[PDB]
A = this chain, B = another copy of it.
Amino acid sequence: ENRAQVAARQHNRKIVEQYMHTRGEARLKRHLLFTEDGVGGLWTTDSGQPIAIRGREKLGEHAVWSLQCFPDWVWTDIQIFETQDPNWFWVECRGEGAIVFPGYPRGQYRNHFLHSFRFENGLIKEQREFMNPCEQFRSLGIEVPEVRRDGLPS
C-alpha cells in the first residue's frame, strides 16, 4: 500500500511538472496528459460558474483557442505541492502573457494561480485553475468593481 502510493506520487509529480512547463506549440498536445474523460478548466470566473472542459477531445479543441488568446503564456514561480493523496497535487504559481480576446485591445495579463491536479491511473483526471478574475478584467481594460473601504478598519 505504501509502495504503491509512493510509486503513484513520483510519476504524477512528473506529469504536473510537464504540464506546468508546457508552452508554445506543445500546448496543443497538453490534453494527452489527461485521461480520456479528464476535465480541465477555470474555476474562478466572473459568472461564478467554472469553465469546465470535459474530455480529451474538448481539451484538445480548447488548446487551439488557448494558444490563440494567450499566445505566449508562461507559468512562472512554480511551486508544486505533493499531498497525502498520491493522486492529488496543488501548484501555486504566477502566469503571464498577452491576452488576445476578440473585441478587446491586446493586453498584458498577469495573475496569481492555484492549480489542482487529481490523477487516475497515471494521468490527469481533473485539473482546475483558480485565479483572481479582477486581474483579467484589468488586462482587458474592463473596469474592476471596487469594494468601498471607508467603513473598514485600516
Contact = CB atoms under 8 A, between A and B. Distances in A.
A153 B81 contact: no
Given A101-B150, A142-B146, A145-B145, 7 more contacts: A45-B147, A46-B145, A82-B83, A101-B152, A114-B130, A130-B130, A137-B147
A58 interface: yes
Given A81-B84, A147-B46, A152-B65, A133 B135 contact: no
Interface residues of A, number: 50
A153 B101 contact: no
Contacts of A81: 81, 83-85, 88, 90
Interface in A89-116: 90, 92, 101-104, 112, 114, 116
- Chain A at the B interface: SS class: loop
B140 A103 contact: no
A39 to B, nearest CB: 14
18 contacts: A46-B144, A46-B146, A47-B146, A48-B134, A48-B135, A64-B153, A65-B152, A68-B151, A81-B83, A81-B88, A82-B83, A101-B151, A101-B152, A102-B148, A102-B150, A103-B148, A133-B133, A140-B147
